[PDB]
Amino acid sequence: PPVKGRATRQRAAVSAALQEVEEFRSAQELHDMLKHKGDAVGLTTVYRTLQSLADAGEVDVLRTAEGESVYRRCSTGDHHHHLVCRACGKAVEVEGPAVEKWAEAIAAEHGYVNVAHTVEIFGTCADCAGA
């Protein structure tokens, strides 16, 4: 995930950490991980970097049930939706044109100019139920 500004070891470290994992996580958890592996990088620095990348769209954003935003470097750059298990944190890339067509149809029927859609599905794995 390239950054608009000059690359620095802190930005490179947070980018390497983002590509290292595949689950959703907020600024605090990733700050904990990077400090523990030996990065020594700031909280506000990672917050600003994540804001910048979200503006660039290289990563995705998702507001949890409480409200805090979590982030994930998705392999697929095209339009897509994520199926997330809160117990595991795993994200599965799922895309469907049916929901997009439905959104466009209802927007046209209501005469709305633009449509921004948030479609999140929260569930639990089969292994989660098992013990």
Per-residue contact string for residues 38-77; x = within reach of Zn ion by CB under 5 A? ----------------------x-------------x-x-
Other CB atoms within 10 A of residue 90 CB: 13
CA atoms of 85 and 22, how far apart (whole Å): 13
CA 12 – CA 18 distance, rounded (Å): 10
- Residue 94 interacting partner from Zn ion, a second copy, none (CB closer than 5 to 8 Å by kind): a second copy
Cβ atoms of 59 and 18 within 8 Å: the answer is yes
If the CB atoms of residues 36 and 79 are measured against Zn ion, the closer one turns out to be 79
- Distance from C-alpha of 118 to C-alpha of 13, rounded to nearest angstrom: 30
Report how far residue 41's alpha carbon sits from residue 27's, in angstroms, rounded to the nearest whole number. Answer: 11
Site residues for a second copy per CB under 8 A? 63, 67, 69, 83, 85, 92, 94, 96, 98-99, 101-103, 106-107, 110-126, 128-129
Residue ranges for the binding site? 60, 74, 79-82, 85, 88, 93, 95, 100, 117, 125, 127-128
Site residues for Zn ion per CB under 5 A? 60, 74, 76, 80, 85, 87-88, 93, 99-100, 125, 128
